[PDB]
Amino acid sequence: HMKNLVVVDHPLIKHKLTIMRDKNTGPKEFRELLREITLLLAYEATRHLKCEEVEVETPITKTIGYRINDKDIVVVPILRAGLVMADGILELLPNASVGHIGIYRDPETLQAVEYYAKLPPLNDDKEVFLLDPMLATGVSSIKAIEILKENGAKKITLVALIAAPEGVEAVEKKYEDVKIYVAALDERLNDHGYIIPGLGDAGDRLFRTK
Amino acid sequence: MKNLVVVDHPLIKHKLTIMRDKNTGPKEFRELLREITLLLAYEATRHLKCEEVEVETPITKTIGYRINDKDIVVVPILRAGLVMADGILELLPNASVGHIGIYRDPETLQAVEYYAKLPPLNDDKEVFLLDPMLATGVSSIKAIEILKENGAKKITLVALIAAPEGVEAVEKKYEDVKIYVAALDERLNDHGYIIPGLGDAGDRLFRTK
Amino acid sequence: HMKNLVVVDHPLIKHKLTIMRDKNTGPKEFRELLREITLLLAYEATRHLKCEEVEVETPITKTIGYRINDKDIVVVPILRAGLVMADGILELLPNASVGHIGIYRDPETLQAVEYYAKLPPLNDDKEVFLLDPMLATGVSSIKAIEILKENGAKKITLVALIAAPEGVEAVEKKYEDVKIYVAALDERLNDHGYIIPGLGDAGDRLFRTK
Amino acid sequence: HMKNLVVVDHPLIKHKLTIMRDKNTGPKEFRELLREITLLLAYEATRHLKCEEVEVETPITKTIGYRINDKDIVVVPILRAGLVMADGILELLPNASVGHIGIYRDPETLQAVEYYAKLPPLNDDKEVFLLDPMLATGVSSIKAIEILKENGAKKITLVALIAAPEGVEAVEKKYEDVKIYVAALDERLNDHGYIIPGLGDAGDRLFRTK
Ligand SMILES: O=c1ccn([C@@H]2O[C@H](COP(=O)(O)O)[C@@H](O)[C@H]2O)c(=O)[nH]1
Ligand SMILES: O=c1ccn([C@@H]2O[C@H](COP(=O)(O)O)[C@@H](O)[C@H]2O)c(=O)[nH]1
Ligand SMILES: O=c1ccn([C@@H]2O[C@H](COP(=O)(O)O)[C@@H](O)[C@H]2O)c(=O)[nH]1
Ligand SMILES: O=c1ccn([C@@H]2O[C@H](COP(=O)(O)O)[C@@H](O)[C@H]2O)c(=O)[nH]1
């Protein structure tokens, strides 16, 4: 069904995600696991990046190596919970430019509310990685993509922890070219827009807010 | 090379190329080694077995997955394997850790153990053995020897760069050991360094001569 | 003249801060150094925290040890640049609750307004650490303290990298009980509200935005 | 009345140390705490380092800053347990040279056995930081100091987690110029050379060895 979805299949991700799902897992551990899983999802999510051959001189001899255009990578957390994922991916892409997009989803209305967007310069060359752990209805990530495109972004990859089918479908309907990398695809949403079985409220579980 | 996996990822190639570069100092070199090890870890741990287990999420009960976490063993070869171990332990924080010190003689091409301190090993244990430079292979073959002497069965070798001779030597002796690397280089020079390689890994990590 | 100000005097902080100040220092290194300085400033900023005696059994024998009320610590970055400080402090206080505050400061009117604030439960018992690297006019941190107090915060400690006299003075005028820990006190503000000699625009230098 | 001993008094160190002492604390957490305590002990152990004034140009203006001779710092773990400490201090001193000294203490004879020493160049200018968590009889650290001095080291600082009085005294008797920074001074040694109340076997508890 889901042309643009990659569900990353790795035993360590399964392991770690299951601990996150567990309601007894507190915020220190929940954050650690989120960072760690993002590091593994990063493997798959960045596999597409382009290399240029470049000469290198080693201590022994000259040879031909490889280079990515490093400043051309843009990492964009959706606040708050995407912050922790951004920390993870920046361990792998430490010379990326970073944007921040503040959106929350209104609990009652289930619409996205934008409160901040500060982005580095964007153009056709820029590879953007947008990060938000829970892709539920999709309204938040769609809004963030809207803001990215508006500001010149072309190539955008979404990295999430868990998606629901309707969220993935929503993103595909609007933005057919956006690839989505996740640790799991769950079953559906409950009446309050939470992913089932999911893991509850990610922001609250990360930061101990109520 | 039946047992060799050369991990092909653009981020690994990028980072490895900076490590190769003679101008890259110790602080960066270490960072890059740890970062590459995190990526090589993906591929090197793909084989680990899951058990299904019940979990209750805040929403509902469901079926999740679990690895026997204490049954993983991480074993750096001193010194330069230390930085790799730091990397992999980010991903496998509940592993037991062993340490092995081997001196390789350049003149005779023989290896001897100077230290080995291991956690309990048995058939169930998944051992990851870490050394950046797999050159002649004698060091990793000695470390595998020690591991097997102490009860290890399943051993996976993770390295940064290998030379063909080192890979062959390991496969001749220990045909079941899988080897994950960032690169397979061309050959060794008259002093047993990998070409083009990256020089002396330990010295470049810690700024020793 | 500055009752509530602690300028932390340590050769490593001076060293690292000098590197941040240097205009050639790129975003990767600037972030690193900010986190590392925050770790050292943490030493002094948390020295006041109260211990309870508790029994502990070690593998050899029982003894009396010490404990802090860990979940009663609250870390609050001011977005964006406080985010990197928060990562630093959370390495030492990983069981803290985390709040996030977004304040716009208007350059033309000198007024500050909240655009986001998401806080964990606050009360008299909670030890709050509020983090923002550049304490210039002071209006941003004063608005954040206002919001904290509004939501029940009592004990609040400000941690910054560099402050200007006017900022310190402004905080002391409003909130006489807030202690302020910094790596340096600089000379003054320029016509555009930047600290001299300071280090430029901290957010932009951390994230490579313009 | 131990002239060269500094017991670092900080409520976060006491908090963290108490968790390490607790026999139920597993290897993952034990390692994190040892690295975190070392960061705090680093504050006090490096306070003495010497600054040179240097010019820096910030994006705003030229000013006078500070600089330490960074490559002139040497970090030396005693294997194995010292490794985790070195990892912590290297977070603050990332440009330091690193030596390794392999010594274990024979459980039966309580004598130090050296199996490895690989050191960067040493001279009178070099500031050496020697790290080993448990300073019990002193034999290990005395042997390591011996090796350092033999190779040209002059200024040496010992950082440990817990010391026993007899170990501190033994170091003072031999090397009266070596300062020792620790998180705690415990009471005495038992019959097998373990610190009471201490925390058991540091190497085993870090790495899950028997
Ligand atoms: O099970 C869920 C579903 C949604 N959200 C939150 O709601 C937003 C995503 O929902 P949506 O905009 O994709 O519907 C994010 O802020 C996310 O953290 C959760 O925490 N858990
Ligand atoms: O190009 C090389 C070749 C070997 N070694 C070092 O030699 C050992 C591997 O030797 P071998 O036993 O595989 O020949 C390791 O400890 C490694 O750091 C290097 O640093 N660079
Ligand atoms: O020299 C300066 C002065 C201010 N700011 C920014 O302005 C805010 C502090 O402003 P103020 O409200 O203290 O004036 C912070 O968000 C900070 O990043 C700087 O980056 N550099
Ligand atoms: O309570 C103790 C006492 C000693 N040691 C170990 O013994 C050595 C220090 O003892 P000594 O040489 O100071 O006597 C170190 O390897 C240290 O890890 C412990 O682990 N726990």
What does the alpha-carbon distance between residue C160 and residue C189 come to, in Å, rounded to a whole number? 16
The H or E element spanning position B195 is strand B194-195
Decide: A163 in ligand 1 pocket, CB within 6 A: no
Which residues are CB-contacts of D154 (< 8 A; sequence separation ≥ 6)?
D123, D124, D126
What is d(CA B121, CA B127) in angstroms, rounded to the nearest whole number? 9
A78 Cβ contact partners less than 8 Å away, ≥ 6 residues apart = A101, A102, A103, A130, A131, A132, A140, A141, A144
Dihedral, CA of residue C34, residue C37, residue C43 and residue C48, to nearest 10? -60
Q: Taking the C-alpha atoms of C168, C173, C175 and C178 in order, what is their torsion angle to the nearest 10 degrees?
A: 30
Residue type, B145: E
Neighbours of chain D (3+ CB pairs under 8 A): B, C
Strands C73-77 and C97-98: parallel
- Enumerate the residues of chain B whose CB falls inside 8 A of the CB of residue A45: none
* Amino acid residing at B99: H
Indicate the DSSP class of residue C78. Answer: B
Residue found under tokens 């590392």: C36
CA-based nearest residue to B180, from B169, B167, B193: B167
Query: Length of chain A, please?
Result: 210
* β-bridge pairing A73-79 and A100-105: parallel
Could you give the angle at which helices C82-92 and D27-45 cross, rounded to 10 degrees?
Answer: 110
Count of other CB atoms within 10 angstroms of residue C195: 29
Q: How far is the CA of B39 from the centre of ligand 3 (A)?
A: 37
Helix (H) or strand (E) holding D13: helix D11-21
Q: Minimal CA–CA distance to D207: which of D138, D133, D119? A: D133
CA distance D77 to D101: 6
User: From residue D142, how far is each of B1, D150, D166, D185, D191 by CA, in Å?
Assistant: 49, 12, 12, 18, 20
Question: CA torsion sign, B176 to B177 to B178 to B182?
Answer: negative
- Please give the Cα distance from B75 to B65 (Å, whole number): 25
Q: What is the DSSP letter of C49?
A: P
**Ligand minimally distant from the alpha carbon of residue C180:** 3
Half-sphere exposure (CA, 13 Å, Cβ side) for A29? Answer: 15
Scan residues 97-156 of B and list those with Cβ closer than 8 Å to A: none
3-state secondary structure of D101: strand
Rounded (5°) CA angle B114-B120-B126 = 95
CA-CA-CA-CA torsion sign (A148, A154, A159, A160): positive
DSSP, collapsed to helix, strand or coil, labels residue A62 as strand
Q: What is the DSSP string of D35-47?
A: HHHHHHHHHHHTT
B96 vs D121: CB contact, 8 Å cut-off?
no
Contact C137, C110 (CB under 8 A): yes
Q: Report the C-alpha gap between A43 and A41 in whole angstroms.
A: 5
The helix (H) or strand (E) run that includes residue A149 is: helix A139-150
Q: What is the DSSP letter of D55?
A: E
List the catalytic residue out of B46, B60, B108, B123: B108
User: In testing the pocket of ligand 3, which one of C31, C132, C142, C209 has its CB within 8 Å of the most ligand atoms?
Assistant: C132
CATH 3.40.50.620 assigned to D1-210: no
Local structure of A139: helix, strand or coil: helix
Task: Give the C-alpha separation, B178 to B175, whole Å.
Answer: 8
Helix (H, G, I), strand (E, B) or coil at C75: strand
The domain made up of B1-209 has a fold known as Rossmann fold (3.40.50)
CA distance D87 to D82: 9
Query: Which residue from B207, C62, B7 is spatially nearest to A43, judged by alpha carbons?
Result: B7
Q: Is the CB of B170 under 6 A from ligand 2?
A: no
B11 and A69 Cβ atoms separated by less than 8 Å: no
- Whole-angstrom Cα distance, residue D21 to residue A74? 44
Query: D192: buried, middle or exposed (CB in 10 Å: 19+, 13-18, 0-12)?
Result: exposed
| Six-digit token string for C179 | 């202690």
**36-95 in chain A: CB under 8 A from chain B:** 36, 39-40, 43, 46-51, 54, 56-63, 65-68, 70, 91-93
Nearest-angstrom CA–CA distance, B67 and D162: 35
Provide the 8-state DSSP code for B83. H
Cβ partners under 8 Å of residue A164, min gap 6: A135, A136, A137, A185, A186, A187, A188, A189, A195, A196
Q: Are C119 and A209 in contact (CB under 8 A)?
A: yes
* Other C-beta atoms lying within 10 Å of the C-beta of residue A34: 27
Q: Kindly report the number of other CB atoms within 10 A of residue A152's CB atom.
A: 12
Tokens matching residue D77: 């773990």
Helix, strand, coil distribution of chain C in percent, nearest 5: 35, 30, 40
* C-alpha pair distances (Å), C31 with each of C27, C190, D192: 6, 24, 47
CA contacts within 13 A on the Cβ side of A61 = 12
Q: Please tell me whether residue D155 adopts helix, strand or coil conformation.
A: strand
Strand order across the A162-163 sheet: A134-135, A162-163, A184-185
Q: Strands A73-79 and D195-196, how do they pair?
A: unpaired
CB contact under 8 A, A102 and C79: yes
At C15, list the tokens: 């060293």
CA distance A14 to A20: 10
Structure tokens at D64: 């006078």
Report d(CA D178, CA D170) in Å as an integer. 11
Q: How far is the CA of C105 from the centre of ligand 3 (A)?
A: 9
Pairing of strands B161-162, B183-184: parallel
Residues whose CB is less than 8 angstroms from the CB of residue B59 and which lie 6 or more positions away in sequence, other chains included: A190, A194, A195, A196, A197, A198, A199, A200
Residues 6+ apart with CB under 8 A from D163: D5, D134, D135, D136, D180, D182, D184, D185, D186, D195
Angle, alpha carbons B160-B149-B161 (nearest 5°)? 10
Cα dihedral D200/D202/D204/D208 (nearest 10): 110
> How many whole angstroms separate alpha carbon A113 and alpha carbon B67?
39
| Domain locations in chain C as residue ranges | 1-210
**CB of D113 within 8 A of CB of D84?**
no
The DSSP H or E segment spanning C17 is: helix C11-21
Residues preceding chain discontinuities in chain D with C to N over 2.5 Å: none
Atom of ligand 3 nearest to the CA of C196: 1
Alpha helices in D151-201 (DSSP H): 165-174
> Using CA atoms, how far apart are residues A64 and A55, in angstroms rounded to an integer?
4
Experimental technique for the deposited model: X-ray
Is A121 among the annotated ligand-binding positions? Answer: no
Integer CA distances (angstroms), C46 to A95, B180, C5, C34, C120, in order: 32, 45, 15, 18, 20
The count of residues in chain D is 210
In angstroms, the CA C88 to CA C92 distance is 7
- Tell me how many degrees the CA angle B172-B173-B175 measures, rounded to the nearest 5: 70
Number of neighbours of residue A208 by Cβ within 10 angstroms: 20
Residues in chain A followed by a break, C to N above 2.5 angstroms: none
Contact C142, C172 (CB under 8 A): no
Count CB-CB contacts under 10 A for residue D16: 23
- Quick one: DSSP state of residue A72? T
Which long-range contacts link D61-66 to residues 24+ away (Cβ below 8 Å)? D61/C196, D61/C197, D62/C197, D63/C21, D63/C197, D65/C14, D65/C17, D65/C18, D65/C21, D65/C22, D66/C11, D66/C14, D66/C15, D66/C17, D66/C18
Helix, strand, coil in percent for chain A, rounding step 5: 35, 30, 40
Annotated binding-site residue? C82: no
Would the CB atoms of B91 and A40 count as touching at under 8 Å? yes
What angle do helix axes A27-45 and B26-44 make, rounded to 10 degrees? 80
Q: Where are the beta strands (DSSP E) in chain A?
A: 5-7, 52-57, 62-67, 73-79, 97-98, 100-105, 112-118, 127-131, 134-135, 155-159, 162-163, 179-182, 184-185, 188-189, 195-196
The response to whether B185 counts as a known ligand-binding position is: no
Structure tokens at A179: 């690839």
Chain C residues lying within 8 Å of D67, measured CB to CB: 15, 18
